[PDB]
Enzyme design. Sequence first.
Site, PDB file in Angstrom:
ATOM      1  N   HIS A 282      -1.189   6.558   2.759  1.00 44.71           N
ATOM      2  CA  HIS A 282      -2.118   6.568   1.605  1.00 44.71           C
ATOM      3  C   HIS A 282      -2.440   5.436   0.856  1.00 44.71           C
ATOM      4  O   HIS A 282      -3.172   5.445  -0.098  1.00 44.71           O
ATOM      5  CB  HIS A 282      -1.277   7.713   0.463  1.00 44.71           C
ATOM      6  CG  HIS A 282      -0.384   7.055  -0.550  1.00 44.71           C
ATOM      7  ND1 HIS A 282       1.057   7.092  -0.055  1.00 44.71           N
ATOM      8  CD2 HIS A 282      -0.468   6.514  -1.541  1.00 44.71           C
ATOM      9  CE1 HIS A 282       1.489   6.446  -1.221  1.00 44.71           C
ATOM     10  NE2 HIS A 282       0.776   6.029  -2.017  1.00 44.71           N
TER      11      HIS A 282
ATOM     12  N   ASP B 150       3.169  10.453   5.962  1.00 45.43           N
ATOM     13  CA  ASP B 150       2.447   9.439   5.367  1.00 45.43           C
ATOM     14  C   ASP B 150       3.024   8.053   6.022  1.00 45.43           C
ATOM     15  O   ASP B 150       3.777   7.392   5.545  1.00 45.43           O
ATOM     16  CB  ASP B 150       2.951   9.316   3.829  1.00 45.43           C
ATOM     17  CG  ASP B 150       2.260   8.320   2.874  1.00 45.43           C
ATOM     18  OD1 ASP B 150       1.300   7.958   3.387  1.00 45.43           O
ATOM     19  OD2 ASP B 150       2.626   8.049   1.714  1.00 45.43           O
TER      20      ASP B 150
ATOM     21  N   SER C 199       4.529   1.626  -2.810  1.00 48.52           N
ATOM     22  CA  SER C 199       4.153   2.650  -1.780  1.00 48.52           C
ATOM     23  C   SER C 199       4.291   2.245  -0.152  1.00 48.52           C
ATOM     24  O   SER C 199       3.756   2.973   0.520  1.00 48.52           O
ATOM     25  CB  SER C 199       2.975   3.246  -2.030  1.00 48.52           C
ATOM     26  OG  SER C 199       3.334   4.572  -2.622  1.00 48.52           O
TER      27      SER C 199
END
Lengths: 142, 259, 41
Positions: free
Chosen positions: B43, B99, B205
């Site tokens: 992402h 992810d 992230s």
Amino acid sequence: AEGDDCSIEKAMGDFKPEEFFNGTWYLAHGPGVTSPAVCQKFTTSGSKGFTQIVEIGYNKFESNVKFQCNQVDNKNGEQYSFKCKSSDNTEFEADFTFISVSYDNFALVCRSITFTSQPKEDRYLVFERTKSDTDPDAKEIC
Amino acid sequence: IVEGQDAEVGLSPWQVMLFRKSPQELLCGASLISDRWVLTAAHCLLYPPWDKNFTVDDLLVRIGKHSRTRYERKVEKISMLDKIYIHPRYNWKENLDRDIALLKLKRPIELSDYIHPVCLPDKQTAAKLLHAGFKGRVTGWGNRRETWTTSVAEVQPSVLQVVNLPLVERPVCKASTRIRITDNMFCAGYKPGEGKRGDACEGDSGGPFVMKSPYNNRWYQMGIVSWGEGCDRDGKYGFYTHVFRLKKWIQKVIDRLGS
Amino acid sequence: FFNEKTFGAGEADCGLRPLFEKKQVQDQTEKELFESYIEGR
């Protein structure tokens, strides 16, 4: 370094040349290297922009030499070219392809130096807006 | 990182920073797995809902750093990507399942005291270490708090942060959300009953969730900072991509040339 | 697990920090990780 080619690179587009060609930028070729230092005074063909680039650690330059660089019209394609002349009358062309830059912090740039002697030389360099202490003060060297 | 502390210099030489060429902006964290391979979350590159769709030509990786806004001549190395590999089964419509992304540098970086690869979990390592209660470490230059009164500046750190979070049991992770949890993810964080707290937040992230092995003294990356609902909320945990579960895929995209 | 041709160098010596593990020094918070291995019976 051998493999890099500023020619086939891509400039940043939103580059505002006058925010860059203004003031002093320090450029070292390694953490340690502090010799030679060489001061280059750049003048953009337009709004003056007397920029002082203090380059450190470049074994091709003599320690007590100054360069006066004037912008030329060569390499019109997203590239800023400069012809530099020195106290020892060296002369070489320097082309800058700006990759990423924060006009008040640092700038990643692909540079092609072409000395009248051995031509063609590409290397990704980082121009710093802040002096890394060990660096000579631009006022002393320039 | 929420409720963490300034990381010592060289604390995690595998912490990579995803940086955007123009405008200059910190996008995410990443992990150095070899001198030419860097691991991160999908992402950070592909996420249509936010209009994210970065290519190798939009970013650059800054390795060896400590400060987040500052260019560090003595320790930092800037590199460019040659290829971005995102998992075919990456589910961004639903729960950010799988992810994960693997990035290849154009030329191998120069390892030093500030740049060095983390180990990838083994079948025995994953088995002996992935146990509810055991802690792991998360590092990043993301926000220090879920919100700010006046400006984001208040929550943005100056240097790399470090927080150690314990592994939580899957049933708890499942009972904390109304979102689908899959085998490709695990959660960590303090239960409300423990007088401690800490979490990853926006800007972390891609960073690695690592654990130090008591058997061989090596740091293994067990997870990748993926998602959550807010940051450091009571009864809420952070979800990391189960790296060991997608180990076979990693090997599959890495070994694609004469071997 | 990985080759080296495609993978590159790093694996055989991964996970050991030059400034810590390789220098026999431990960071400020390693103890927190080791105690989390306590296991009550």
